[PDB]
Amino acid sequence: AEGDDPAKAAFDSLQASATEMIGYAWAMVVVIVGATIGIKLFKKFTSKAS
Amino acid sequence: AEGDDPAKAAFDSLQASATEMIGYAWAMVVVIVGATIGIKLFKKFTSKAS
Amino acid sequence: AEGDDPAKAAFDSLQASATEMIGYAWAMVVVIVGATIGIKLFKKFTSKAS
Amino acid sequence: AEGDDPAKAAFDSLQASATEMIGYAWAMVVVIVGATIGIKLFKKFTSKAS
Amino acid sequence: AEGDDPAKAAFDSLQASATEMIGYAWAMVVVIVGATIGIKLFKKFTSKAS
Amino acid sequence: AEGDDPAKAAFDSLQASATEMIGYAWAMVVVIVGATIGIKLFKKFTSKAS
Amino acid sequence: AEGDDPAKAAFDSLQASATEMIGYAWAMVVVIVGATIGIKLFKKFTSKAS
Amino acid sequence: AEGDDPAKAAFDSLQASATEMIGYAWAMVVVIVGATIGIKLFKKFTSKAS
Amino acid sequence: AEGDDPAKAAFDSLQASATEMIGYAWAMVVVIVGATIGIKLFKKFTSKAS
Amino acid sequence: AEGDDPAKAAFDSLQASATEMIGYAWAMVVVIVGATIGIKLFKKFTSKAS
Amino acid sequence: AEGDDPAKAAFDSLQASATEMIGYAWAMVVVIVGATIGIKLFKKFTSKAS
Amino acid sequence: AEGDDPAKAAFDSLQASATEMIGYAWAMVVVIVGATIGIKLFKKFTSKAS
Amino acid sequence: AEGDDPAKAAFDSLQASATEMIGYAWAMVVVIVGATIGIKLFKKFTSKAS
Amino acid sequence: AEGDDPAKAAFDSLQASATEMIGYAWAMVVVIVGATIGIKLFKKFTSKAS
Amino acid sequence: AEGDDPAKAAFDSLQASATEMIGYAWAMVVVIVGATIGIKLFKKFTSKAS
Numbered sequence: 001a002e003g004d005d006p007a008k009a010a011f012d013s014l015q016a017s018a019t020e021m022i023g024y025a026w027a028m029v030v031v032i033v034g035a036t037i038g039i040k041l042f043k044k045f046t047s048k049a050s
Numbered sequence: 051a052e053g054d055d056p057a058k059a060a061f062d063s064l065q066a067s068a069t070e071m072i073g074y075a076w077a078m079v080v081v082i083v084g085a086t087i088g089i090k091l092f093k094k095f096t097s098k099a100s
Numbered sequence: 101a102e103g104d105d106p107a108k109a110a111f112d113s114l115q116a117s118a119t120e121m122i123g124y125a126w127a128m129v130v131v132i133v134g135a136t137i138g139i140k141l142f143k144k145f146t147s148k149a150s
Numbered sequence: 151a152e153g154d155d156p157a158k159a160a161f162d163s164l165q166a167s168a169t170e171m172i173g174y175a176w177a178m179v180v181v182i183v184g185a186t187i188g189i190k191l192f193k194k195f196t197s198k199a200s
Numbered sequence: 201a202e203g204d205d206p207a208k209a210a211f212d213s214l215q216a217s218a219t220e221m222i223g224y225a226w227a228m229v230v231v232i233v234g235a236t237i238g239i240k241l242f243k244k245f246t247s248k249a250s
Numbered sequence: 251a252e253g254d255d256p257a258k259a260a261f262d263s264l265q266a267s268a269t270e271m272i273g274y275a276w277a278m279v280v281v282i283v284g285a286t287i288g289i290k291l292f293k294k295f296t297s298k299a300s
Numbered sequence: 301a302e303g304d305d306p307a308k309a310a311f312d313s314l315q316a317s318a319t320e321m322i323g324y325a326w327a328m329v330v331v332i333v334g335a336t337i338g339i340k341l342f343k344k345f346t347s348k349a350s
Numbered sequence: 351a352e353g354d355d356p357a358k359a360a361f362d363s364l365q366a367s368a369t370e371m372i373g374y375a376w377a378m379v380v381v382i383v384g385a386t387i388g389i390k391l392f393k394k395f396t397s398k399a400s
Numbered sequence: 401a402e403g404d405d406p407a408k409a410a411f412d413s414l415q416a417s418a419t420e421m422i423g424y425a426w427a428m429v430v431v432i433v434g435a436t437i438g439i440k441l442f443k444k445f446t447s448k449a450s
Numbered sequence: 451a452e453g454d455d456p457a458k459a460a461f462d463s464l465q466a467s468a469t470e471m472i473g474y475a476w477a478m479v480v481v482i483v484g485a486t487i488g489i490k491l492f493k494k495f496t497s498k499a500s
Numbered sequence: 501a502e503g504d505d506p507a508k509a510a511f512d513s514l515q516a517s518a519t520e521m522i523g524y525a526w527a528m529v530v531v532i533v534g535a536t537i538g539i540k541l542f543k544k545f546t547s548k549a550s
Numbered sequence: 551a552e553g554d555d556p557a558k559a560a561f562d563s564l565q566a567s568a569t570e571m572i573g574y575a576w577a578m579v580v581v582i583v584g585a586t587i588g589i590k591l592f593k594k595f596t597s598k599a600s
Numbered sequence: 601a602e603g604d605d606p607a608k609a610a611f612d613s614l615q616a617s618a619t620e621m622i623g624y625a626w627a628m629v630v631v632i633v634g635a636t637i638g639i640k641l642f643k644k645f646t647s648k649a650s
Numbered sequence: 651a652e653g654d655d656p657a658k659a660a661f662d663s664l665q666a667s668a669t670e671m672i673g674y675a676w677a678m679v680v681v682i683v684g685a686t687i688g689i690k691l692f693k694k695f696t697s698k699a700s
Numbered sequence: 701a702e703g704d705d706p707a708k709a710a711f712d713s714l715q716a717s718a719t720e721m722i723g724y725a726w727a728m729v730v731v732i733v734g735a736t737i738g739i740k741l742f743k744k745f746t747s748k749a750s
Contacts (some may be wrong), residue, residue, distance in 0.1 A: 003083045005078035013351035029092045042379045047382045080110040095125045101163035129192045140199045149190045151213035161224045179242045190249045230260040251313035279342045290349045323446035329442045340449045360530040375545045430460040445475045451563035479592045490599045524611045535617035542629045549640045551713035561724045579742045590749045613651035624661045642679045649690045662729040
């Protein structure tokens with residue numbers, strides 16, 4: 001109930017850092033998936049021709 | 051039985067602090083899991099296309 | 101039984117996100133399949149002429 | 151044998167919370183699988199046409 | 201050899217409490233595993249369709 | 251050798267659930283295969299005419 | 301060398317319990333595999349017709 | 351909120367590497383597909399003559 | 401150098417007990433692993449059929 | 451170098467079990483392939499008549 | 501309130517050392533992760549080709 | 551530098567045991583792979599006939 | 601702030617070792633992937649002929 | 651930076667083993683493909699006669 | 701500053717023993733990893749054939 005007020009910022013400071021790197025884990029996947037899916041179509045273009 | 055009354059607030063003051071940081075451990079996981087699961091689907095979208 | 105009420109929204113918030121991206125996995129397939137099938141007919145038009 | 155009676159509710163309170171979130175893990179899968187399977191058929195419709 | 205007779209109940213009282221909570225650790229796992237396994241099958245139903 | 255008797259029902263309860271959903275994985279395939287094969291004949295009717 | 305004789309039954313009692321549940325892990329797989337393989341054939345019946 | 355600034359470059363350095371190799375996975379497919387499709391036509395030239 | 405002779409049996413008595421229970425930790429693993437590996441093959445039989 | 455002699459039989463006992471089920475994975479395929487190939491000829495008999 | 505002033509530098513001297521080695525634990529992970537992720541892509545390049 | 555000489559055999563005794571069981575992990579794989587590959591060919595014999 | 605200067609080399613000595621073995625984990629993958637991909641083409645050469 | 655020199659041979663010893671078995675994975679495919687392709691021609695000789 | 705000179709050898713004698721057993725922890729891993737990796741390739745040889 002006391003002595004934690006200036007310790008609240010302690011975690012909000014860790015959490016706020018989380019949201020920073022969390023954004024990379026989110027776009028990271030999409031950065032990969034961009035090709036992951038696109039590459040799927042490249043192959044679709046391949047098997048459809050038959 | 052005596053001399054502890056003003057010591058009861060001592061712990062309720064530690065416990066009440068617990069509930070404060072406990073809320074971070076709870077949302078922390080969800081803060082991470084938010085992507086943890088969402089990222090799962092991103093991959094589902096990936097393997098389903100086959 | 102307690103301390104989870106504000107954690108229920110935690111998951112409904114992840115699930116509700118699921119339904120959002122889930123809609124893409126559903127239309128994604130159809131987006132592809134649109135040609136997948138249409139392209140089938142294009143070929144039917146091809147082998148039938150004989 | 152004593153001092154645990156009011157501690158029994160302690161766990162039934164954790165377990166009862168389990169059943170709450172457990173329901174999400176159960177429907178979660180089905181929420182995903184809904185498309186997981188449906189998407190299977192979409193593809194069946196695709197390979198059968200040949 | 202003496203002065204412990206009324207101390208025997210001391211431990212049987214702790215042990216007897218153990219058997220009480222021990223039952224929760226046993227059913228707890230099964231409470232979780234219930235879905236743990238069931239959810240396995242849900243996925244089996246998923247990969248088998250191919 | 252002891253403390254497992256009431257835990258035997260634990261698994262028979264998971265297994266018995268298995269047999270329940272297992273029946274769906276079995277009929278599921280046949281539900282699909284019904285057309286899978288029938289659709290084969292539809293095509294046989296197609297190539298035989300030549 | 302002493303004080304363990306009545307502790308030998310302690311483990312044989314845990315091991316003997318193992319053999320009990322171990323039988324479920326063994327039949328469990330086969331319970332699943334029953335369809336796992338059978339379902340394979342169902343599909344064989346499917347691709348062979350071509 | 352602090353101590354991560356010089357850690358941001360840490361990931362942008364991994365991501366930037368991703369874009370480097372990602373370009374190979376993209377052209378790789380096309381490098382293969384170049385023949386994958388071209389070879390399709392070679393065969394078209396083959397079955398059309400009938 | 402003296403007063404330990406009858407204390408040597410003290411430890412050989414603890415060690416000798418070790419070798420007794422140690423045999424269970426050794427066969428325990430194998431008791432489990434028996435299925436651990438056997439169950440592996442059961443699954444091999446499963447994925448090979450494709 | 452010691453304490454493993456009676457543990458050697460431990461694995462030879464798992465391996466020897468392997469050879470037992472391994473024989474099923476071998477004949478299993480042939481059990482299926484028996485028709486897999488035979489069914490091929492049935493179809494050969496079909497396309498040759500033209 | 502007194503006799504600690506020259507002891508404040510005592511800890512700032514330990515903490516300041518922390519920040520020194522802390523920088524290694526941070527870059528250490530990234531030093532490893534550099535390949536950890538890069539190696540992931542190497543494998544992506546591997547499974548995508550199918 | 552002293553008191554370890556008779557402790558060197560301690561580990562060479564564990565290591566020497568390693569080489570014993572290590573030989574099983576090596577042949578184990580090959581014992582399985584024997585069919586793993588052979589079974590591959592069985593299937594090759596299957597798809598080639600078309 | 602003091603007593604760590606000669607401890608800085610301690611870690612740079614571990615890190616510098618990391619970069620040494622890290623190079624193997626990097627080329628290791630490529631050493632494998634060399635065939636991983638090359639073997640892919642070998643098979644492409646196989647399915648394209650149809 | 652130290653204590654790894656005699657550990658460098660550790661990996662070159664694993665890698666050098668890789669190149670040994672890697673040669674089998676390379677010729678293995680060709681060993682199979684030898685017939686894989688040759689068998690293709692056998693069939694070409696078959697459909698060309700029409 | 702005095703009375704420790706003949707105590708310096710005390711630790712160099714413990715440290716020197718460390719370097720002795722430390723060599724086993726280093727080669728131990730490699731002794732295991734030898735198969736750990738080699739066994740990886742054995743499996744690569746397995747999945748590549750498809």
